[PDB]
Ligand binder design. Structure first.
Ligand code: HEM
Ligand code: HEM
Ligand code: HEM
Ligand code: HEM
Ligand SMILES: [Fe+3]
Ligand SMILES: [Fe+3]
Lengths: 145, 140, 140, 145
């Protein structure tokens, strides 16, 4: 993904403010709630039985951090997302071989969560820069190495 | 089909938009135009700059169409009949673009209504806007 | 909504499948499994090799569910009620996979029924399978 | 896209039999008929008013050949589809900047047309190899250079 300096700045500035212990879990959690077939991919995570159980599940929350982790990595290596993410997908055997759409969905849910948290600071130009990144990351994580 | 709880969650949330109905519609359009620049091609004749009166008015029309759908949630094919004919048959909007605007409408609600946009209401709002989108793309 | 011509085009085409109803369902499943290997994860317990009796039987069930939908085309939510509950609520099938199987069903019909698969009937069949898919993903 | 030799053979063998003057027009045409919002992207092509007008339109038919042209190119350079297609998208200014989904749709319609033409020779394994290619080509043509 090619980001303009203004786009880069918009992303980076707000990313520094993110609660890295919570946002990721909130995004992953709402995916499971809003798009419930996604629970199947997290069979191993235990109790995903209600909005509150989902949102309170430790492995949810933990995997959230990782979601953020992967976003940051993408941010750090935007000209080489396939480079950045081959080991990430390869350590999972087949678990990231799902439709690219669900990575798109997670990206969009992350956007909704960043809007929720940041309110008017998550302006339309800042959203637009984030959509570029979530699109790039989704594609690379779908890629199959 | 939308559940009784979805209908409640939708009416409760969409009832805090309030007199911002208009402004929020505009914001969602702006967010769509900037994030998903292909969508601007349906509006090559609008001025799409920030603060545009044309985006403002159009934003109000879109918001008011949503409120009409909320108000007739059990009879949406009938209530949105004219608009489904418009977008699908008359304007030929790519069905993908409804997912994009729906996402922008969710983003706008999350940015303005942090209390109301719980995970349950987010799910309900998503289902409602997908229902609307289905109606609006049913007449190709 | 499906038009009177779609309904005619669907019944006429789906009425040449005939006693191959079964075989064609199987073929469409096979085509899905090989083209879109993610779909096999819903069937980790089936044997998916060519000529599998389990794919054959399941193919017949899928074809028979389609014929039930064709036979009650004006009342599909009601006719497919049990199956919508199954796929959406009970099995959690990703809605994307219905587009994949629908495409494979079109491929199979095109491979077997070259006369009947004109552009107009292709459009009608596409709309019908999308209608079915919508019903089958309505209960998440 | 990485194709196995058997996949490559399946694709290549049947591709040699294709009526290059017709198949492309048939695929492009059915896209316009089955997925009618696509007509908007071909505003410049004139009369697209009915299934028969679509299927009989000269510029449809002509652009079809090009569709095939681009598929062959993809086939010839599978390890470098972005290389192969940058000039193709760049000569169009903005006309290929549409959702990647419509390139997916065209690919699938091409598949339906190849099934229509080849009947039982378009076997499930041959279809699967073709889906790999149409997926690769769609992605690269969506890419924005
Ligand atoms: C889809 C279902 C997923 C499952 C079942 C899954 C499961 C696992 C497992 C079992 C590990 C090994 C280490 C451990 O047990 O903590 C792991 C590692 C990892 N996963 Fe996932 N994962 C999934 C999705 C994802 C996604 C979507 C991302 C990021 C976008 C992600 C990022 C990571 C990272 C970065 C590691 C490396 C170890 C670490 O940094 O903690 N995973 N995953
Ligand atoms: C939630 C989804 C949507 C709703 C409720 C909606 C509602 C409306 C309404 C009420 C109008 C009529 C305005 C008037 O009478 O002046 C309209 C017009 C229009 N819509 Fe939408 N719309 C939606 C989605 C879309 C999308 C996704 C696009 C394209 C990306 C689109 C493009 C248009 C265009 C081009 C017009 C004509 C604009 C003009 O020239 O004045 N709409 N829409
Ligand atoms: C046109 C679309 C579809 C139709 C009409 C359909 C029809 C059916 C029917 C009738 C059954 C019940 C079989 C029985 O009673 O033994 C069934 C079961 C099932 N379907 Fe579907 N189906 C469709 C799409 C899908 C898709 C897209 C997937 C996944 C990729 C899927 C996965 C399943 C599974 C996993 C079962 C249970 C299989 C078993 O363990 O026996 N279906 N379907
Ligand atoms: C979407 C709408 C499209 C429009 C309006 C369009 C229009 C044009 C125009 C005006 C030219 C210049 C040469 C001429 O006039 O014949 C051109 C060239 C070309 N187009 Fe397109 N095109 C479109 C889509 C596509 C697609 C989807 C493909 C292939 C996948 C394609 C392949 C080509 C090729 C290969 C050329 C180079 C000249 C040639 O080999 O004939 N075009 N196109
Ligand atoms: Fe994951
Ligand atoms: Fe084109």
């Amino acid at each position: 993904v090619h980001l303009t300096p203004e786009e880069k700045s918009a992303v980076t500035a707000l990313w520094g403010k993110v609660n890295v212990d919570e946002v990721g879990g909130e995004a992953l959690g709402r995916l499971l709630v809003v798009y419930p077939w996604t629970q199947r991919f997290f069979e191993s995570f235990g109790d995903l039985s209600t909005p509150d159980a989902v949102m309170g599940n430790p492995k949810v929350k933990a995997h959230g951090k990782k979601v953020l982790g992967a976003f940051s990595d993408g941010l750090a290596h935007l000209d080489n997302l396939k480079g950045t993410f081959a080991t990430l997908s390869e350590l999972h055997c087949d678990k990231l071989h799902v439709d690219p759409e669900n990575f798109r969905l997670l990206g969009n849910v992350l956007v909704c969560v960043l809007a929720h948290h940041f309110g008017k600071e998550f302006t339309p130009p800042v959203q637009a820069a984030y959509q570029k990144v979530v699109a790039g990351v989704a594609n690379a994580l779908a890629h199959k190495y | 089909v939308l559940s009784p709880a979805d209908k409640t969650n939708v009416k409760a949330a969409w009832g805090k938009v309030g007199a911002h109905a208009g402004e929020y519609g505009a914001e969602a359009l702006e967010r769509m135009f900037l994030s998903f620049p292909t969508t601007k091609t349906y509006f090559p004749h609008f001025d799409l700059s920030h603060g545009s009166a044309q985006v403002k008015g159009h934003g109000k029309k879109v918001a008011d169409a949503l409120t009409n759908a909320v108000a007739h949630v059990d009879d949406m094919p009938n209530a949105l009949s004219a608009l489904s004919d418009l977008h699908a048959h008359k304007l030929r909007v790519d069905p993908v673009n409804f997912k994009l605007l729906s996402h922008c409408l969710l983003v706008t609600l999350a940015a303005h209504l942090p209390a109301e946009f719980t995970p349950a209401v987010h799910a309900s709002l998503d289902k409602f806007l997908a229902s609307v989108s289905t109606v609006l793309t049913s007449k190709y």
